[PDB]
Design an enzyme around this catalytic site. Structure first.
Site, PDB file in Angstrom:
ATOM      1  N   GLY A  18     -11.295   3.120  33.203  1.00  0.00           N
ATOM      2  CA  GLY A  18     -11.926   2.544  34.498  1.00  0.00           C
ATOM      3  C   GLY A  18     -13.647   3.873  34.432  1.00  0.00           C
ATOM      4  N   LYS A  41      -3.212   4.114  35.244  1.00  0.00           N
ATOM      5  CA  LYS A  41      -4.298   4.384  35.569  1.00  0.00           C
ATOM      6  C   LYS A  41      -4.138   5.680  35.879  1.00  0.00           C
ATOM      7  CE  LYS A  41      -7.429   2.747  37.337  1.00  0.00           C
ATOM      8  NZ  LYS A  41      -9.345   2.350  37.710  1.00  0.00           N
ATOM      9  N   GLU A  88       1.371  -3.377  39.457  1.00  0.00           N
ATOM     10  CA  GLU A  88       2.100  -4.580  38.115  1.00  0.00           C
ATOM     11  C   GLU A  88       1.013  -4.983  37.524  1.00  0.00           C
ATOM     12  OE1 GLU A  88       1.795  -8.628  40.138  1.00  0.00           O
ATOM     13  OE2 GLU A  88       0.105  -8.007  41.202  1.00  0.00           O
ATOM     14  N   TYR A  89       1.521  -4.710  36.384  1.00  0.00           N
ATOM     15  CA  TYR A  89       0.826  -5.377  35.145  1.00  0.00           C
ATOM     16  C   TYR A  89       0.190  -6.544  35.069  1.00  0.00           C
ATOM     17  CZ  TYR A  89      -0.414  -5.457  29.951  1.00  0.00           C
ATOM     18  OH  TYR A  89      -0.836  -5.734  28.654  1.00  0.00           O
ATOM     19  N   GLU A  91      -1.168  -9.385  32.612  1.00  0.00           N
ATOM     20  CA  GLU A  91      -1.576  -9.848  30.681  1.00  0.00           C
ATOM     21  C   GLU A  91      -2.475  -9.610  30.069  1.00  0.00           C
ATOM     22  OE1 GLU A  91       1.024 -10.588  32.596  1.00  0.00           O
ATOM     23  OE2 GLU A  91       3.124 -10.019  32.458  1.00  0.00           O
ATOM     24  N   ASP A 134     -16.918  -6.744  46.809  1.00  0.00           N
ATOM     25  CA  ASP A 134     -17.194  -6.819  45.193  1.00  0.00           C
ATOM     26  C   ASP A 134     -16.363  -7.955  45.266  1.00  0.00           C
ATOM     27  OD1 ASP A 134     -18.619  -5.702  43.461  1.00  0.00           O
ATOM     28  OD2 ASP A 134     -17.187  -4.330  42.629  1.00  0.00           O
ATOM     29  N   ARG A 138     -14.695 -10.540  37.241  1.00  0.00           N
ATOM     30  CA  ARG A 138     -14.483  -9.327  36.762  1.00  0.00           C
ATOM     31  C   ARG A 138     -13.462  -8.182  37.965  1.00  0.00           C
ATOM     32  NH1 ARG A 138     -18.399  -6.145  39.990  1.00  0.00           N
ATOM     33  NH2 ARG A 138     -19.742  -7.444  40.450  1.00  0.00           N
ATOM     34  N   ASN A 139     -13.106  -8.693  39.466  1.00  0.00           N
ATOM     35  CA  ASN A 139     -12.200  -7.847  39.656  1.00  0.00           C
ATOM     36  C   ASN A 139     -11.433  -9.032  40.317  1.00  0.00           C
ATOM     37  OD1 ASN A 139     -13.951  -5.768  39.789  1.00  0.00           O
ATOM     38  ND2 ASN A 139     -14.771  -6.365  41.879  1.00  0.00           N
ATOM     39  N   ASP A 152      -9.263  -3.967  42.671  1.00  0.00           N
ATOM     40  CA  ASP A 152     -10.756  -3.190  42.429  1.00  0.00           C
ATOM     41  C   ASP A 152     -11.206  -3.259  44.174  1.00  0.00           C
ATOM     42  OD1 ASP A 152     -12.736  -1.413  43.005  1.00  0.00           O
ATOM     43  OD2 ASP A 152     -13.656  -2.580  40.869  1.00  0.00           O
TER      44      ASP A 152
HETATM   45  N1  LIG Z   1      -3.182  -4.217  36.884  1.00  0.00           N
HETATM   46  C1  LIG Z   1      -3.297  -4.133  35.274  1.00  0.00           C
HETATM   47  N2  LIG Z   1      -2.968  -5.258  33.883  1.00  0.00           N
HETATM   48  C2  LIG Z   1      -3.840  -5.068  32.846  1.00  0.00           C
HETATM   49  N3  LIG Z   1      -4.598  -4.753  32.522  1.00  0.00           N
HETATM   50  C3  LIG Z   1      -4.855  -3.696  33.219  1.00  0.00           C
HETATM   51  C4  LIG Z   1      -4.830  -3.401  35.219  1.00  0.00           C
HETATM   52  N4  LIG Z   1      -5.192  -3.193  35.319  1.00  0.00           N
HETATM   53  C5  LIG Z   1      -6.568  -3.159  34.494  1.00  0.00           C
HETATM   54  N5  LIG Z   1      -6.654  -3.316  33.802  1.00  0.00           N
HETATM   55  C6  LIG Z   1      -7.162  -3.629  32.370  1.00  0.00           C
HETATM   56  O1  LIG Z   1      -7.836  -2.330  32.482  1.00  0.00           O
HETATM   57  C7  LIG Z   1      -9.159  -2.342  32.263  1.00  0.00           C
HETATM   58  C8  LIG Z   1     -10.653  -1.146  32.743  1.00  0.00           C
HETATM   59  O2  LIG Z   1     -10.157  -1.937  34.379  1.00  0.00           O
HETATM   60  P1  LIG Z   1     -11.309  -2.501  35.132  1.00  0.00           P
HETATM   61  O3  LIG Z   1     -12.664  -1.777  34.062  1.00  0.00           O
HETATM   62  O4  LIG Z   1     -10.857  -2.224  36.014  1.00  0.00           O
HETATM   63  O5  LIG Z   1     -11.944  -3.978  34.595  1.00  0.00           O
HETATM   64  P2  LIG Z   1     -13.154  -4.475  34.424  1.00  0.00           P
HETATM   65  O6  LIG Z   1     -13.563  -4.058  35.710  1.00  0.00           O
HETATM   66  O7  LIG Z   1     -12.957  -6.134  33.363  1.00  0.00           O
HETATM   67  N6  LIG Z   1     -13.908  -4.921  35.372  1.00  0.00           N
HETATM   68  P3  LIG Z   1     -15.210  -3.792  36.190  1.00  0.00           P
HETATM   69  O8  LIG Z   1     -14.583  -2.282  35.692  1.00  0.00           O
HETATM   70  O9  LIG Z   1     -15.265  -4.401  37.734  1.00  0.00           O
HETATM   71  O10 LIG Z   1     -16.770  -4.127  35.978  1.00  0.00           O
HETATM   72  C9  LIG Z   1      -9.606  -4.152  31.831  1.00  0.00           C
HETATM   73  O11 LIG Z   1      -9.829  -4.894  30.716  1.00  0.00           O
HETATM   74  C10 LIG Z   1      -8.930  -4.865  32.828  1.00  0.00           C
HETATM   75  O12 LIG Z   1      -8.480  -6.079  32.891  1.00  0.00           O
HETATM   76 MG   LIG Z   2     -12.519  -3.149  38.709  1.00  0.00          MG
END
Ligand SMILES: Nc1ncnc2c1ncn2[C@@H]1O[C@H](COP(=O)(O)OP(=O)(O)NP(=O)(O)O)[C@@H](O)[C@H]1O
Ligand SMILES: [Mg+2]
Length: 283
Positions: A18, A41, A88-89, A91, A134, A138-139, A152
């Site tokens: 991130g 994170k 929380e995870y 999957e 937002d 993707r969120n 998010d």
């Molecule tokens: N609680 C979680 N459990 C499992 N995977 C997660 C979790 N939180 C984030 N991730 C993964 O970590 C990766 C990076 O997170 P992030 O950048 O927040 O997602 P991306 O956001 O899919 N969408 P965005 O950043 O809004 O464009 C993504 O593939 C998420 O799905």
């Molecule tokens: Mg996100």
């Protein structure tokens, strides 16, 4: 946020990245000794004060919610570094990227269950006086049982006193009028994303054209084999007059009826002979 003891956190693997650093899977040992899967994170080394404030600020907002369809904050580590946020995870990761792997592979009722979860989380968020700003596929995170949860909170604000153009209501684009009804507009976009299996809203249209077309009354067209009830719900979420959009409670009720009578989803809509890629809504 609960301050966690790092001895209870075990990191497995990096699963993503991130703005503030890496995302890992791992395990958290709870005070009861139960062990759960978590996402961890961590704030990058050499972070700025602004980065720390934004990182933990998003956690502080997340922590005000306790709901099955909002990502759960297990706690934070702030008294040692690197700073960490433990959730929380989930999957199956982010909903848009998950659905793109499975084009046309789910039943309508499965998709409606996903959508109902998102709407329920948003009903609680809006009940709590927050506007997400937002709300986009993707969120949304999705777990091993396909349960979808709002996440998010980086742009979220209490209602008082870059924003994603494709997901934003016309009045919020026009003069920053953000309300729970502008989150309902965004929900309509998420509904289209889900029924389209992660197609990008408005594809790669110039932002200026997304703004102008929507203001002129053009709407995203019905996804392939889209149930009439669901395309109508999209159109309702996209009413020009925000006062005419359904409330989140009403969206949850609409989806609950479709789950209760799946036969209703057999009525389909299309628009193959239409003059343009976007469809002019008369209504
Ligand atoms: N609680 C979680 N459990 C499992 N995977 C997660 C979790 N939180 C984030 N991730 C993964 O970590 C990766 C990076 O997170 P992030 O950048 O927040 O997602 P991306 O956001 O899919 N969408 P965005 O950043 O809004 O464009 C993504 O593939 C998420 O799905
Ligand atoms: Mg996100």
């Amino acid at each position: 946020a609960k301050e966690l003891d790092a001895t209870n956190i075990s990191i497995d693997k990096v699963v993503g990245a991130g703005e503030f650093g890496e995302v890992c899977s791992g395990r958290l040992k709870l005070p009861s000794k139960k062990e759960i899967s978590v996402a961890i994170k961590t704030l990058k080394v050499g972070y700025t004060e602004k980065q720390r404030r934004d990182f933990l600020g998003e956690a502080s907002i997340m922590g005000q919610f306790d709901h099955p369809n909002i990502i759960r904050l297990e706690g934070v580590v702030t008294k040692s570094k690197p700073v960490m946020i433990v959730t929380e995870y989930m999957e199956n990761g982010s909903l848009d990227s998950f659905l793109r792997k499975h084009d046309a592979q789910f039943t309508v009722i499965q998709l409606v269950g996903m959508l109902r979860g998102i709407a329920s989380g948003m009903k609680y968020l809006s009940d709590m006086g927050y506007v997400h700003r937002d709300l986009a596929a993707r969120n949304i995170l999705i777990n091993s049982n396909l349960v979808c949860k709002v996440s998010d909170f980086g742009l979220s604000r209490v209602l008082e006193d870059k924003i994603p153009i494709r997901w934003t209501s016309p009045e919020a684009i026009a003069y920053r009028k953000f309300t729970s009804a502008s989150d309902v507009w965004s929900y309509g976009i998420v509904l289209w994303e889900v029924m389209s299996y992660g197609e990008r809203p408005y594809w790669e249209m110039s932002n200026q054209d997304v703004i102008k077309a929507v203001d002129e009354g053009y709407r995203l067209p019905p996804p392939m084999d889209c149930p009439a009830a669901l395309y109508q719900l999209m159109l309702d979420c996209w009413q020009k007059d925000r006062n005419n959009r359904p409330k989140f409670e009403q969206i949850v009720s609409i989806l609950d009826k479709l789950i209760r009578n799946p036969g209703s989803l057999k009525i389909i809509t299309s628009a193959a002979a239409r003059p343009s890629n976007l469809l002019l809504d008369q209504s």
